[PDB]
Design a protein around this nucleic acid. Sequence first.
DNA 1: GCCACACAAAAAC
DNA 2: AGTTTTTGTGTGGC
Length: 297
Amino acid sequence: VILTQLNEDGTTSNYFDKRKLKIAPRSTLQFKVGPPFELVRDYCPVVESHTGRTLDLRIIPRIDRGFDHIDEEWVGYKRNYFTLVSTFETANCDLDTFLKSSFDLLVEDSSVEGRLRVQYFAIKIKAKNDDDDTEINLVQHTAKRDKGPQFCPSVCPLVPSPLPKHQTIREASNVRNITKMKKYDSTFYLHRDHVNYEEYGVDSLLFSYPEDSIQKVARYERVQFASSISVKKPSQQNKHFSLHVILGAVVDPDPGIPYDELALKNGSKGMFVYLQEMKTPPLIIRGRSPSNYASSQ
DNA sequence: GCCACACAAAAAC
DNA sequence: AGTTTTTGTGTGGC
């Protein structure tokens, strides 16, 4: 009934079928590692503005709630939350140096004056129909759920960091207590206002981030597929979905390559230029039908 | 079919 | 050692 896999940090993922077994909403059994991500592609190269060193980048994503590995399929439920977290890394490039440096997008080689300055790096997530690439709406809630606002996942400015262990994501999922919040603060945030400003040049990457509080980890919790999504094909076969994580550089718009428009802080129209994208294997999503639940048995 | 509210069980404190 | 919070899911109204 429950199939158990050991996670990297020594916790367990316990996969079960909600058609057959009902477990309490707050049981630690609802936390589990979801499907592994795979590279879709790399997009625009990034170089350091002084040395010309190519910045090697890697997205490091994980799903920590909402998906079970059942009979060689990954299965989620329309009605329930999932959690998707991600960081990125810059191999052989330490954070302290990275933040003092500045970076350009190489849109065209052999054009030293043909480079856009990166203001900051950021992640976004998307859901798609894995068979035809059509995008599917995601919705997020606060902990208050219906007694609070609903919103679409947003673009998250981030600095490179190791991805926290599964247990750490669990532990930080519903922290209100001030003392405990402080314990986790250095894991999830870089507070630019707390650095020694004298160590930084005006053009440094750190000081082109939009806000003083900068995330180290993109944490998308309490996410759902929109309640209007059709989860079956007309043939009654299951639709296959995929979750995508995209790392981008935000630049000033002042374009033959992939990008999305972004509403900037100063009001103008930023550009989120794609750098790398990863995706999950195909996902099945079970709808609200009573037959998807053990109560029907 | 999608919404709104309802119940309840374990986490959080 | 209690009370509040959070979230899977049962249910009714249109």
